[PDB]
Scaffold this active site. Sequence first.
Site, PDB file in Angstrom:
ATOM      1  N   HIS A  58       0.826  -1.205   0.000  1.00  0.00           N
ATOM      2  CA  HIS A  58       0.000   0.000   0.000  1.00  0.00           C
ATOM      3  C   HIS A  58       0.863   1.259   0.000  1.00  0.00           C
ATOM      4  O   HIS A  58       2.010   1.234   0.450  1.00  0.00           O
ATOM      5  CB  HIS A  58      -0.902   0.021   1.238  1.00  0.00           C
ATOM      6  CG  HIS A  58      -2.058  -0.929   1.172  1.00  0.00           C
ATOM      7  ND1 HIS A  58      -1.972  -2.176   0.590  1.00  0.00           N
ATOM      8  CD2 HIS A  58      -3.324  -0.819   1.640  1.00  0.00           C
ATOM      9  CE1 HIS A  58      -3.139  -2.788   0.689  1.00  0.00           C
ATOM     10  NE2 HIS A  58      -3.975  -1.987   1.324  1.00  0.00           N
ATOM     11  N   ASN A 144      -6.285   0.730  -3.227  1.00  0.00           N
ATOM     12  CA  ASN A 144      -6.907  -0.288  -2.376  1.00  0.00           C
ATOM     13  C   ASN A 144      -8.287   0.114  -1.852  1.00  0.00           C
ATOM     14  O   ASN A 144      -8.500   1.261  -1.446  1.00  0.00           O
ATOM     15  CB  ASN A 144      -6.003  -0.633  -1.191  1.00  0.00           C
ATOM     16  CG  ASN A 144      -6.565  -1.755  -0.334  1.00  0.00           C
ATOM     17  OD1 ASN A 144      -6.626  -2.910  -0.758  1.00  0.00           O
ATOM     18  ND2 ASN A 144      -6.977  -1.416   0.883  1.00  0.00           N
ATOM     19  N   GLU A 145      -9.210  -0.847  -1.867  1.00  0.00           N
ATOM     20  CA  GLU A 145     -10.542  -0.697  -1.270  1.00  0.00           C
ATOM     21  C   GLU A 145     -11.173   0.688  -1.485  1.00  0.00           C
ATOM     22  O   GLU A 145     -11.335   1.451  -0.530  1.00  0.00           O
ATOM     23  CB  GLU A 145     -10.495  -1.039   0.221  1.00  0.00           C
ATOM     24  CG  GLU A 145     -10.253  -2.510   0.511  1.00  0.00           C
ATOM     25  CD  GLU A 145     -10.062  -2.804   1.988  1.00  0.00           C
ATOM     26  OE1 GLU A 145     -10.759  -2.189   2.826  1.00  0.00           O
ATOM     27  OE2 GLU A 145      -9.218  -3.667   2.311  1.00  0.00           O
ATOM     28  N   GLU A 262      -6.565 -10.401  -0.749  1.00  0.00           N
ATOM     29  CA  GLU A 262      -6.658 -10.269   0.710  1.00  0.00           C
ATOM     30  C   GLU A 262      -7.592 -11.363   1.243  1.00  0.00           C
ATOM     31  O   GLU A 262      -8.658 -11.085   1.800  1.00  0.00           O
ATOM     32  CB  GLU A 262      -7.126  -8.863   1.125  1.00  0.00           C
ATOM     33  CG  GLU A 262      -5.998  -7.850   1.282  1.00  0.00           C
ATOM     34  CD  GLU A 262      -6.465  -6.471   1.720  1.00  0.00           C
ATOM     35  OE1 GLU A 262      -7.368  -6.381   2.580  1.00  0.00           O
ATOM     36  OE2 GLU A 262      -5.911  -5.468   1.213  1.00  0.00           O
ATOM     37  N   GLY A 268      -8.758  -7.455  10.188  1.00  0.00           N
ATOM     38  CA  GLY A 268      -8.027  -6.785  11.267  1.00  0.00           C
ATOM     39  C   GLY A 268      -6.739  -7.486  11.662  1.00  0.00           C
ATOM     40  O   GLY A 268      -6.719  -8.258  12.625  1.00  0.00           O
ATOM     41  N   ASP A 312      -2.583 -11.674   3.413  1.00  0.00           N
ATOM     42  CA  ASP A 312      -2.098 -10.313   3.642  1.00  0.00           C
ATOM     43  C   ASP A 312      -1.429 -10.210   5.013  1.00  0.00           C
ATOM     44  O   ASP A 312      -1.986  -9.627   5.948  1.00  0.00           O
ATOM     45  CB  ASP A 312      -3.261  -9.319   3.522  1.00  0.00           C
ATOM     46  CG  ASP A 312      -2.799  -7.906   3.227  1.00  0.00           C
ATOM     47  OD1 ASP A 312      -2.048  -7.707   2.246  1.00  0.00           O
ATOM     48  OD2 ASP A 312      -3.207  -6.985   3.962  1.00  0.00           O
ATOM     49  N   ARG A 326      -1.584 -10.871  12.710  1.00  0.00           N
ATOM     50  CA  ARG A 326      -1.579 -11.559  11.414  1.00  0.00           C
ATOM     51  C   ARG A 326      -0.301 -11.254  10.623  1.00  0.00           C
ATOM     52  O   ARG A 326      -0.298 -10.424   9.709  1.00  0.00           O
ATOM     53  CB  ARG A 326      -2.830 -11.226  10.600  1.00  0.00           C
ATOM     54  CG  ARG A 326      -3.094 -12.206   9.465  1.00  0.00           C
ATOM     55  CD  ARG A 326      -3.624 -11.500   8.228  1.00  0.00           C
ATOM     56  NE  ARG A 326      -4.969 -10.968   8.427  1.00  0.00           N
ATOM     57  CZ  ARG A 326      -5.403  -9.823   7.913  1.00  0.00           C
ATOM     58  NH1 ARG A 326      -4.597  -9.072   7.168  1.00  0.00           N
ATOM     59  NH2 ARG A 326      -6.645  -9.422   8.153  1.00  0.00           N
ATOM     60  N   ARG A 455       7.520 -15.380  28.713  1.00  0.00           N
ATOM     61  CA  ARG A 455       7.206 -14.250  27.829  1.00  0.00           C
ATOM     62  C   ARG A 455       8.112 -13.024  28.036  1.00  0.00           C
ATOM     63  O   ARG A 455       7.611 -11.913  28.228  1.00  0.00           O
ATOM     64  CB  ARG A 455       5.730 -13.849  27.974  1.00  0.00           C
ATOM     65  CG  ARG A 455       4.746 -14.823  27.346  1.00  0.00           C
ATOM     66  CD  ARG A 455       3.452 -14.927  28.139  1.00  0.00           C
ATOM     67  NE  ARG A 455       2.919 -13.621  28.520  1.00  0.00           N
ATOM     68  CZ  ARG A 455       2.799 -13.183  29.772  1.00  0.00           C
ATOM     69  NH1 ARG A 455       3.165 -13.948  30.795  1.00  0.00           N
ATOM     70  NH2 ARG A 455       2.305 -11.975  30.003  1.00  0.00           N
TER      71      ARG A 455
END
EC number: 3.2.1.76
Length: 603
Positions: A58, A144-145, A262, A268, A312, A326, A455
């Site tokens: 993008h 995009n979109e 996508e 999200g 994506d 993601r 962690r």
Amino acid sequence: EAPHLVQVDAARALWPLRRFWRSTGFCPDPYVLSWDQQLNLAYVGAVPHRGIKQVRTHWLLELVTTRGSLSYNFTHLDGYLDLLRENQLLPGFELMGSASGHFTDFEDKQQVFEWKDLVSSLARRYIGRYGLAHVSKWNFETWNEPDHHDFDNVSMTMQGFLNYYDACSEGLRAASPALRLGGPGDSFHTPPRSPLSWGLLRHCHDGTNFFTGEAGVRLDYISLHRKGARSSISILEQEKVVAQQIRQLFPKFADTPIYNDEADPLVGWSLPQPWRADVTYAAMVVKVIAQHQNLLLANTTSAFPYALLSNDNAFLSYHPHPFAQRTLTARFQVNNTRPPHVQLLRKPVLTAMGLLALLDEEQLWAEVSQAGTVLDSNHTVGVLASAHRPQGPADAWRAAVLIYASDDTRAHPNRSVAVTLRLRGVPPGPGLVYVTRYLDNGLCSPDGEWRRLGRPVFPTAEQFRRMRAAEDPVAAAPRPLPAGGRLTLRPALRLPSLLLVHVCARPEKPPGQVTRLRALPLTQGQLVLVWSDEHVGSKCLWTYEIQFSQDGKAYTPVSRKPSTFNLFVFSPDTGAVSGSYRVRALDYWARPGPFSDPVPYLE
Ligand SMILES: *[C@@H]1O[C@H](CO)[C@@H](O[C@@H]2O[C@H](CO)[C@@H](O[C@@H]3O[C@H](CO[C@H]4O[C@H](CO)[C@@H](O)[C@H](O)[C@@H]4O)[C@@H](O)[C@H](O[C@H]4O[C@H](CO)[C@@H](O)[C@H](O)[C@@H]4O)[C@@H]3O)[C@H](O)[C@H]2NC(C)=O)[C@H](O)[C@H]1NC(C)=O
Ligand SMILES: *[C@@H]1O[C@H](CO)[C@@H](O)[C@H](O)[C@H]1NC(C)=O
Ligand SMILES: *[C@@H]1O[C@H](CO)[C@@H](O)[C@H](O)[C@H]1NC(C)=O
Ligand SMILES: [Cl-]
């Protein structure tokens, strides 16, 4: 799950198996030129056998600045595209951005003409920089979109978007007719929803070209976005509905390729999801691909021109969710060192792309059944099986069988499947061997290891080593295939899990040379070695042997877990990294390829 029988017939090649899934994407001294992004793209490019080819990016035209009121400065765009080129990646070139605030209104006739000029000048620049043949491979795409209306101080109406497209199309045409343009890159919901989407198709089908006045405008492919809302089969189901509507409304678009660039499990990218952290995401990704191959592309009655699927997930994760977003990699910004540094971890999803990359050109007959009932890919357990016919002396016959066990976004820590794999019809060949590779959350989750360590926000050197030990699949050393070209395996698979069975005959010649080796600094005592496998010539590789030379030019092995991933983080306990490095391929028969040209490194 109850016991599953998986039958593969290696004597029964059916049709081509196109590698339609080799794409990723993300949305942003610019962010794309940061050391983080340079490491990220080295990791993306390190998937063996061009496992990921396209990076859909993008805001590429926000990397361009304008002079006067008219020339363009391409320095930052040069940097990013050079970065992709170096990693042997291609841009999903979205024509998206305002050229640093110059473009504001696409119903302004002057600006529409200026946009066309910009597009032509940028295409000509990069044709010049990389060559026509290379740039011809790039998927150029609309903003995009357009129905989500994400235009930064840019005014884009229905008419504006049509003018913008004509400028895009004519701009690319002036540079070269070989260059490919598609869109709109949106959802195509039921009318009167998605007006800019259906409006583009109608305009390309019947509309007047802004520049020439002719009826109809070029549209090389139709790109949509469909997410699954946590369901894998839902992605395919929505795609078929949209493709059918396009087919019926637009006679001219009967054979126009469709991309879902996508095609994610869930909207999200930055929303933390436990299943995104590990093999659950990995297995679902394979499942989606297996579903598209078997239920859409294989001998179907529909025969929809589906050409590309893109996850994506090239984004970079942030605190406090290094694993749960993601993304292909887990990012650790270690701020307590001098200076602060960045570390990337390879997530199981990235590793799974490497397993997918081992699939070859012909799809083999395979059947999955439960107590005599045949099950398609619209199920928890499925398979993609492929074969390779020998072309050169550097390669022989191959088969790759990828079995998934996936309940989409749900992991089941207790749940297991008894599988009986029955492979038959492997043709006669020299030195036939098989290798199994297995992924699950218990054995191959860097996230699981991170949590096991408490962690740590800023992991130590040793903690990073421990987490990296969980990146690779568990692999058995090559075993000679029994005569008759047959093999029965009874593996126990977890939910989620992936199992690749690789069956290979022995090529006459050893592997080719490793190329494009480079050394990137991470921090004191640590570096990343990345290389290309473009010329190795075969997929039957056990590992890449790395050697190091401190004293003069005498090289010694660097001991490591076997891996086929084209990248290795070198972090010795002594911190001694300055010297020279060389890498060679090692095949299933312990035959080495020639060493890469050596690469010097000095802290
Ligand atoms: C080590 O040092 C690095 C920098 O060197 C730090 O990295 C920063 O970390 C923070 C998170 O802690 C990052 O900020 C986060 O950015 C997300 C995306 O920001 C963009 O998008 C939003 C709109 O969607 C814009 O407003 C924004 O301008 C950006 O364009 C945000 O979504 C995050 O917000 C969430 O968390 C905050 C709390 O921090 C909440 O208030 C919000 O409600 C929301 O839930 C977040 O702000 C930042 O981008 C990183 N910077 C860089 C340069 O990478 C590390 O944090 C540091 N490590 C430690 C342990 O301190
Ligand atoms: C383009 O901008 C960069 C700053 O990003 C600058 O260094 C460079 O000199 C500019 N190029 C030209 C030709 O003005
Ligand atoms: C997938 O399975 C569900 C039932 O679980 C069914 O309703 C649906 O039609 C199936 N979809 C496809 C594309 O096979
Ligand atoms: Cl997702």
